[PDB]
Structure 1
Amino acid sequence: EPRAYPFNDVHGLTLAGRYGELQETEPVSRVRPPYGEEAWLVTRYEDVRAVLGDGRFVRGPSMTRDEPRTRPEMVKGGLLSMDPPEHSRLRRLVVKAFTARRAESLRPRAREIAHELVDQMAATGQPADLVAMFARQLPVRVICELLGVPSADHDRFTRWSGAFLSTAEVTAEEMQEAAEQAYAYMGDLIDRRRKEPTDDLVSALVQARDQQDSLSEQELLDLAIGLLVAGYESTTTQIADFVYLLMTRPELRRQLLDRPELIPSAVEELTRWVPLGVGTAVPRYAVEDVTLRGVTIRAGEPVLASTGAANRDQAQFPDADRIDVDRTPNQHLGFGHGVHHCLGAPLARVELQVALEVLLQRLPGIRLGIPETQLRWSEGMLLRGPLELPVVW
């Protein structure tokens, strides 16, 4: 009797038709996921937004419950699993050091990195795999620059962080040693920035103060690693998805070639339109009985709030299925909302603006080097994107 969920087919970026049907007829409904408990699905923009910004919906039970999810393991911990007030303290300290200014300051280095990755693609010659060569490379190198990892070490961060990808084919024993080595490096680097501060993020976290608090050694170390993981896969996938769309939606490519000044606005409109997630935001749990648009969610029931479906909700975005690079307003939920709203978002926007800008500067004739019927899509089951994008230009 609950619907089998996810609805989205991972082999592509198409929004499941069942969402539009639910948004009209059963905006809060019962779903059964591949693993974990039955849950409530929330689909409309107002409701998704209410849920994510209502402190009555918490994340803390995720530490002990059998969470609704697509994969048999549970991934627990980090900032996304924490509730106010301990969440709030870490976040206040991180957003103090990790500011929009600091994001903006990395644009010139992000462009240099993107151009170097295109040079390497030019050198290997066509067709070249935009996924392996650019999308999987840029986000992790940019995050290494943000944190302050010396560039001599960026190659091997890339290799370690690759073990933490939901698409990775690694043994659990290889992934564990990748994690031990990553942590050991970062703990060492935090210790070097303590004794001798630089202008990088690790130094600024070591010395951030709020009221009278500061991050502890372990907090620093978890938060640095977390930012790397949080920052990598989601950015890589969304680059791969945006290029894929530029290659398959010709009116969109033409527009941004004609008017590159529309790129920042195009990044917001694609973040809105691409239903990136296979399913929803990580489950929230009702702290007490709450009524949501006539349906009572009892205390402790999990809620799956779809930002995907929300961002395509006709009541909020007129002609919601149209990509309109000049759409205003565009208050989308693609970076979340409320206390857990993406703290990487100013940087992710810079990376996505730079990726588009540079790719269209360098490879304006870019297109798929294979038929779409032969694209391989990711079956990681967390985000939707291509495994390889062979391109010609």
Structure 2
Amino acid sequence: EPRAYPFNDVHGLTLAGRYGELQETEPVSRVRPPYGEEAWLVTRYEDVRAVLGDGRFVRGPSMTRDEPRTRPEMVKGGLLSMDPPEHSRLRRLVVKAFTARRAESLRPRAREIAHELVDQMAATGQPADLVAMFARQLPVRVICELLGVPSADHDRFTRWSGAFLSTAEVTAEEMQEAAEQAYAYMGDLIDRRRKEPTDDLVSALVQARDQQDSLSEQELLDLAIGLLVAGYESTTTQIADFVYLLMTRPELRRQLLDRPELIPSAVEELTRWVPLGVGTAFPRYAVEDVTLRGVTIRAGEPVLASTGAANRDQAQFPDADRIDVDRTPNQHLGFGHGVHHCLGAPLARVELQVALEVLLQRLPGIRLGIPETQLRWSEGMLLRGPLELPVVW
């Protein structure tokens, strides 16, 4: 009686119909994922928001439970693995360094980088893979700027990061090697900035105080790396998906060309609309019994709260399936909700606005280089997006 989950076809960005159906008739329902525990699946915008924001649903048991998931091999730890108060402490310190202003200050470099990337892509000739040449390039490089990795080092570092993508074609031996390398490198860099502070995120992380309390050498390392993993795959896949949408929907492209100042609010709207995850990601566990739409979730059970479904809930967004770049209000859960809500959001927004702005300015007539139906989609199973987006212009 639990439904096989996930419901989404990875071959595209379609939101499965099961979701809407369950929002009507079974808003708290049972699912069996391909790996880990059978779980509750919550699909209404209201209930998903409730779950993500309730002190009774925790992440700490993730370290010691077989989480419902679409992959076999699980990455654990980081901030997404912690509860208040331990989480609060680390999060307080990080966001003191990692301000909205710091996010904004990187806009110019993000533009330079995107432009250079479009330069290298143009140089290969048409068709050109926008996935490999731009999408998988821009966010890791922006992360390098943010952190304060010297430019001489961006290429080597970018290359180490590629092994952490769910779509990477690599051995466990190949991957440890890259991990040990990025760790060793991040550590040295942290040491250097502590001895000799600059204006980069690493320096500000080293010097962040929250009343007498500070980040340890271990917390600083794990955090720097955590931001790269949190900030890379997601933003890459989201740039890809967004441009896919741009190239397949004439009205979407025409409005952003006519009024580039709509790009920000379009980024919001696409963030709501694109159901980015194969599944729901990041199960919450009940610390005690909880009743929701009249069903009792018992203490210790996992809960999958689908932001992808939430964001297309007809009860919260008028004509939820329509892409309206002018949507007001637009309180989507694209970037999570509650204490774990994406701490990279301000930067992510900057990158997404910049990828669209620059792509549109340089290749206003960029479009698929092959039929939509021939597109090869990623079967990495964490996120949904093209493995290759060949484009012409």
Task: Give the alignment's TM-score, normalised by structure 2.
Answer: 0.99
The CA deviation at 1:374 is 1.1
Residue deviations 1:332-382 (CA, integer Å, cap 9, x gap): 000000010000000000000000000000000000001112111000101
- Return the alpha-carbon distance in structure 1 between the equivalents of residues 282 and 229 of structure 2: 16
The CA deviation at 1:189 is 0.2
Q: Percent identity?
A: 100
- Return the alpha-carbon distance in structure 2 between the equivalents of residues 126 and 72 of structure 1: 38
Residue deviations 1:184-234 (CA, integer Å, cap 9, x gap): 001000010001000000000000000210000000000001101110000
Q: Secondary structure in 2 aligned to 1:163?
A: helix
Q: CA RMSD in A?
A: 0.5
- Return the alpha-carbon distance in structure 1 between the equivalents of residues 125 and 261 of structure 2: 29
Contact 1:36 1:69 in 2 (8 A): yes
- Return the alpha-carbon distance in structure 1 between the equivalents of residues 91 and 156 of structure 2: 28
Q: Secondary structure in 2 aligned to 1:170?
A: coil
Question: Unaligned 5+ residue runs, structure 1?
Answer: none
- Return the alpha-carbon distance in structure 2 between the equivalents of residues 258 and 24 of structure 1: 39
The CA deviation at 1:83 is 0.8
Q: Which residue of 2 aligns with 1:167?
A: 167
- Return the alpha-carbon distance in structure 2 between the equivalents of residues 124 and 36 of structure 1: 44
Contact 1:281 1:307 in 2 (8 A): no
Contact 1:60 1:81 in 2 (8 A): yes
Contact 1:59 1:81 in 2 (8 A): yes
Contact 1:370 1:390 in 2 (8 A): yes
The CA deviation at 1:113 is 0.2
Q: Secondary structure in 1 aligned to 2:41?
A: strand
Contact 1:28 1:295 in 2 (8 A): yes
Q: Secondary structure in 2 aligned to 1:314?
A: coil
Contact 2:69 2:281 in 1 (8 A): no
Q: Which residue of 2 aligns with 1:215?
A: 215
- Return the alpha-carbon distance in structure 2 between the equivalents of residues 229 and 301 of structure 1: 27
Q: Which residue of 2 aligns with 1:378?
A: 378
Contact 1:286 1:297 in 2 (8 A): yes
- Return the alpha-carbon distance in structure 1 between the equivalents of residues 171 and 122 of structure 2: 33
- Return the alpha-carbon distance in structure 1 between the equivalents of residues 74 and 273 of structure 2: 28
Contact 1:314 1:320 in 2 (8 A): yes
The answer to whether 1:236 aligns with 2:227 is no
Contact 1:167 1:379 in 2 (8 A): yes
Contact 1:135 1:237 in 2 (8 A): yes
- Return the alpha-carbon distance in structure 1 between the equivalents of residues 73 and 155 of structure 2: 29
- Return the alpha-carbon distance in structure 2 between the equivalents of residues 147 and 367 of structure 1: 34
- Return the alpha-carbon distance in structure 2 between the equivalents of residues 314 and 72 of structure 1: 33
Contact 2:289 2:296 in 1 (8 A): yes
Q: Which residue of 2 aligns with 1:198?
A: 198
Residue deviations 1:65-96 (CA, integer Å, cap 9, x gap): 11101111121111111111111100000000
- Return the alpha-carbon distance in structure 1 between the equivalents of residues 161 and 119 of structure 2: 23
- Return the alpha-carbon distance in structure 2 between the equivalents of residues 86 and 188 of structure 1: 26
The residue correspondences of 1:105-120 to structure 2 (distance < 5 A) are 105-120=105-120
Residue deviations 1:273-306 (CA, integer Å, cap 9, x gap): 0000001031000000011121110000000000
Query: Which segment drifts farther, 68-77 or 313-322?
Result: 68-77
Q: Secondary structure in 2 aligned to 1:323?
A: coil
Q: Secondary structure in 2 aligned to 1:40?
A: strand
Contact 2:32 2:39 in 1 (8 A): yes
